[PDB]
Design a binder for this molecule. Structure first.
Ligand SMILES: CCCCCCCCCCCCC/C=C/[C@@H](O)[C@H](CO)NC(=O)CCCCCCCCCCCCCCCCCCCCCCC
Lengths: 149, 69, 49
């Protein structure tokens, strides 16, 4: 409605403005690299390390950006009470540079991980399924504000 | 002019008042300790969580050093 | 394909019949002609042989 839009415009949303700041694009890569080295430090075979890296990163990103609705602090009357953090990025404007960069990352991650478990069809299928079903679908332009049961 | 404010001496002046290379070893150790401590959120945690983070980091470092050799 | 997109804003809802009716009732037009300056110009009609 009107009041709702005026409330959503009256303040910059501190819950979703930190993305466009100095060093988030880099921190994503950094945490990916750190997870890789941690799983390497475990000691198992490379395919297990890489599939664990992919699952851990994808599931963490989904649980943080796509699971919880609202803001962790008072913002307005309600304003953003029925939106996840991914739906608040750049005040509901799709396909901005930040969204493009966050979309590209899982695909390139799968491409790099691909050449280690290519010989096993089970791991390859599971990795592709999880990636394309959790890291590319909720971030699409037609899943926006799509509530189901 | 004089007021009722009690002053606190600087740490350099305190060391001057209280007077080999054991001091240098102690100060390099404390430099390392502070450099490790303040860059991780240990002031913002409780005791159990801080202890578990400590043992986690110690285990990571020990395993990495063992693997390096 | 993903990198090619243009960055649009989500489409808005269309207006409602009650909203349309209220907007139409808010609009007010002008008269067909301007009766403000008719009297200080109407000497021409009165002075025509
Ligand atoms: C809900 C109960 C679920 C019970 C299950 C337990 C889950 C608990 C852990 C997850 C909870 C997350 C809930 C939502 C958290 C955020 O959204 C909150 C609330 O919006 N944002 C804010 O406070 C505003 C932003 C605050 C700073 C965010 C940036 C901090 C640094 C993150 C940089 C990006 C990190 C890389 C992307 C995610 C990678 C995940 C790494 C996974 C490996 C480590 C985790 C296992």
């Amino acid at each position: 409605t009107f009041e709702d839009e005026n409330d959503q415009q009256m303040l910059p949303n501190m819950n979703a403005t930190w993305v466009d700041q100095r060093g988030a694009w880099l921190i994503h890569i950094v945490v990916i690299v750190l997870l890789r080295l941690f799983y390497s430090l475990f000691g198992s075979t490379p395919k297990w390390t890489w599939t664990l890296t992919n699952m851990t990163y994808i599931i963490g990103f989904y649980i943080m950006f796509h699971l919880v609705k609202g803001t962790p602090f008072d913002f307005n009357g309600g304003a953003y009470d029925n939106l996840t953090m991914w739906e608040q990025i750049n005040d509901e404007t799709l396909y901005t540079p930040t969204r493009k960069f966050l979309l590209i990352v899982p695909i390139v991650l799968f491409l790099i991980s691909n050449q280690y478990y290519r010989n096993d069809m089970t791991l390859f299928l599971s990795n592709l399924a999880v990636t394309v079903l959790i890291g590319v679908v909720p971030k699409l332009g037609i899943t926006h504000r799509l509530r189901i049961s | 002019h004089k007021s009722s404010m009690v002053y606190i001496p600087t740490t350099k002046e305190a060391k001057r008042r209280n007077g080999g290379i054991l001091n240098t070893i102690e100060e390099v150790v404390e430099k390392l300790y502070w450099t490790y401590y303040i860059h991780l959120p240990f002031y913002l945690m409780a005791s159990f969580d801080s202890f578990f983070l400590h043992v986690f980091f110690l285990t990571i470092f020990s395993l990495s050093f063992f693997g390096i050799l | 394909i993903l990198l090619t997109r243009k960055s649009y804003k989500p489409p808005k809802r269309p207006l409602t019949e009650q909203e349309i009716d209220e907007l139409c009732d808010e609009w007010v037009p002008e008269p067909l002609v301007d009766p403000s300056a008719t009297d200080e110009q109407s000497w021409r009609v009165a002075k025509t042989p």
